[PDB]
Structure formats: C-alpha cells, structure tokens
Design a protein around this ligand. Structure first.
Ligand code: NAP
Ligand code: CL
Length: 325
C-alpha cells in the first residue's frame, strides 16, 4: 500500500499526492538564509517527493532553487515532485488570484504548481502587508465572497497553471459553500488543517472522506510551539506517555509514531524540519505499522483542543473554528 518508493494516494481530480511531504514554514527572524533550500534538497535526497510551501513564508525562491537543482542533476523529473502553494488572505479579490499564482510560479521559476490552496477562508485588506491592522491594532477585514475567489482559482487550473485545487482551514459549512456552488467546475480535492493525535479531526475527516476530499495534516508533529501562534501552556504532543511508550515498542520516536498514525488512516502529513537528522527520521515511517488496537489507543488521545486556534481572528465573519467542525 505505502512504501518509501511508492506512497502516493489518489485525488478526486485524477491526480495523486505523496502521503508525506516536507513543510517549509520557518520564522524568518530566526532562520538562516539558505536553510530552506538545503532542507528541501536533503528531503528530496531522502525520498520526499512532496513539498508544502507558501509565498508568505518568504522562502519560496529557496524552495524553487532546491527543486530546480534536483531536477537539473537528474535526481527527479518535474512530474515526480509535488509542490503545494497557498493564496493568502490579502489576495482573495478574484482579479488578484491569477496574478498572485503567477508571482509564485515566477519565484519558483516553474511552469505550474501541483496544488494551490486558499490558505484561510478569511479575506483581509489587500496591500503590501499580510497582516493589515490600523493604529489601534484592529484587524482590517475585507468583506469577501469565497465562491468568487474559487471561480478565479478554477480559471488558474483551466489555464494549466496548477494541477489541483484545494483549501485550508475550512470548516464543513465553508466546504459546503464551494461544493454547492452554482456551476461548480472543479471541486476542492484537499483540505489542509491541523491534525495529530491530540486533535484528530474525526468529524471533519468523516465529512471530507464522504466528499472525496483528502485531509492534509499541518502541524502533524504538534507545531514548533511558538507562543505567538501556540498555547505553550498545553502539554507538548511529542512528550505524550503513550506515543513514547509505543515508540519504545517499535524502536521509533514519538514523532515517527505520530506520523505513522496519520498516514495509516490515509491522512497526508507535512512535518517541517530543517534539521538533517530529523528530516531523515520523519521519513522512516514505512517500515512498520500500528495494530488496530494501537490505532484505537492513539485516536483516543484526541483532546478536541487545537494548538493553532488563531484567536486574533476569532471575530472575523469567516473564522473557521467557532463551529463544531
Ligand atoms: N495551512 C496552514 O494554515 C498551515 C499552518 C501551519 C503549518 N502549515 C504547514 O505545515 C507544516 C508543518 O507544520 P509546523 O511547521 O507548524 O509544525 P510541525 O511540522 O508539526 O513540527 C515542526 C517543529 O517540529 C520540530 N521537529 C521536526 N521533526 C521533529 C522530530 N522528528 N522530532 C522532534 N522535533 C521535530 C521542528 O524543528 P526542526 O526544524 O529544528 O527539526 C519544528 O520546530 C508547516 O511547515 C507548513 O508547511 C500550514
Ligand atoms: Cl499569497
């Protein structure tokens, strides 16, 4: 079913997605220039064939540098690599969608991306700032139309600029808005959301599975626990007693147990690491499996509590986390 050499799963539009990818968000401040490029190259050498990135991570040029180098030396063909990029909240105006994607293609110096997704269901004020606020720190919200944004996304696939379309941080209602759109041409094939044993997304997973939407687990290792985004008070996922106990049983780390858990139930995982040893460690998840009982015990770790709550945006008309799922 899944091996280091062959671990792609089907998307509803006929394409396929490698079940593990390398995440590439890293705080610009505390990240050396070049760390991203080096990690993407190491990842590709290790066997990763999926890279998840975003223009607003400020390192897409490094991602592109790395991918193009490996293609040029014959390590991979372009068709072997799956790159996912993301449309930010300040770029939701339908007229801006294609120019925004074209900017990413030019930065990557590639002809298309494999997956392009709406990063969040919330629109912010368009401009030179990804986090638009007034002097009082009030979040400058744009009153926006998700369906109109989606239509603009559909035009990008129509033009050949992206193979697959998806979304991120969408709840059931928001997914329904799109799925029910008048004259829908291309349904979202993916929803990228926080997913791991402390937040296993049972309701959203069920819903997506019923609509042939694949979940991609972001922060699948429980985040880097940065207090800006994460509630540092919470117990760190990788210190969990059961996950560590299961680790000893298989001579795997809690991280490897956590990744295996999600892929084993058909959830894509995109752990980020810019560390040589940990990039390799995270990929070694195809030489063991978890028993039905172990899967059940891990799933039971579910706390229905998020590490990434985005409370700064809780009042936005399109804040996704009020609803149950
Ligand atoms: N769509 C969205 O809204 C959204 C939100 C968040 C993230 N994402 C995507 O999902 C990716 C991953 O989520 P994430 O970066 O937030 O957090 P994560 O992948 O769950 O974990 C990242 C943290 O774990 C550390 N780490 C990695 N492997 C490890 C291991 N084997 N053992 C111990 N520690 C390990 C990394 O440090 P080192 O680098 O030093 O190894 C980093 O601090 C992101 O990079 C991004 O591509 C998307
Ligand atoms: Cl963007």
């Amino acid at each position: 079913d899944l091996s280091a050499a062959s671990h792609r799963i089907p998307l509803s539009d006929g394409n396929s997605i490698p079940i593990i990818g390398l995440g590439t968000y890293s705080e610009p401040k505390s990240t050396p220039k070049g760390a991203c490029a080096t990690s993407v190259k190491v990842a590709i050498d290790t066997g990763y064939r999926h890279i998840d990135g975003a223009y607003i991570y400020q390192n897409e040029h490094e991602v592109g540098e790395a991918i193009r180098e490996k293609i040029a030396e014959g390590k991979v063909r372009r068709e072997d690599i799956f790159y996912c990029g993301k449309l930010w909240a300040t770029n939701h105006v339908p007229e801006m969608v294609r120019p925004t994607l074209e900017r990413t293609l030019r930065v990557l110096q590639l002809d298309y991306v494999d997956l392009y997704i709406i990063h969040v269901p919330m629109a912010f004020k368009p401009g030179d700032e990804i986090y638009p606020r007034d002097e009082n720190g009030k979040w400058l919200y744009h009153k926006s139309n998700l369906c109109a944004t989606w239509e603009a996304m559909e035009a990008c696939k129509d033009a050949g600029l992206v193979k697959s379309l998806g979304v991120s941080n969408f709840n059931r209602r928001q997914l329904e808005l799109i799925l029910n759109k008048p004259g829908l041409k291309h349904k979202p094939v993916s929803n990228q959301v926080e997913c791991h044993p402390y937040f296993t997304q049972p309701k959203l997973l069920k819903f997506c599975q019923q609509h042939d939407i694949v979940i991609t687990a972001y922060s699948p290792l429980g985040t880097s626990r940065n207090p800006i985004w994460v509630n540092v008070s919470s117990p760190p996922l990788l210190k969990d007693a059961l996950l560590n106990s299961l680790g000893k049983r298989y001579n795997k780390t809690a991280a490897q147990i956590v990744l295996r858990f999600n892929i084993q139930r058909g959830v894509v995982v995109i752990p980020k690491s810019f560390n040589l040893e940990r990039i390799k460690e995270n990929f070694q998840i195809f030489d063991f499996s978890l028993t039905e009982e172990e899967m059940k015990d891990i799933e039971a770790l579910n706390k229905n509590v998020r590490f990434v709550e985005l409370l700064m945006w809780r009042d936005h008309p399109e804040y996704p986390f009020h609803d149950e799922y």
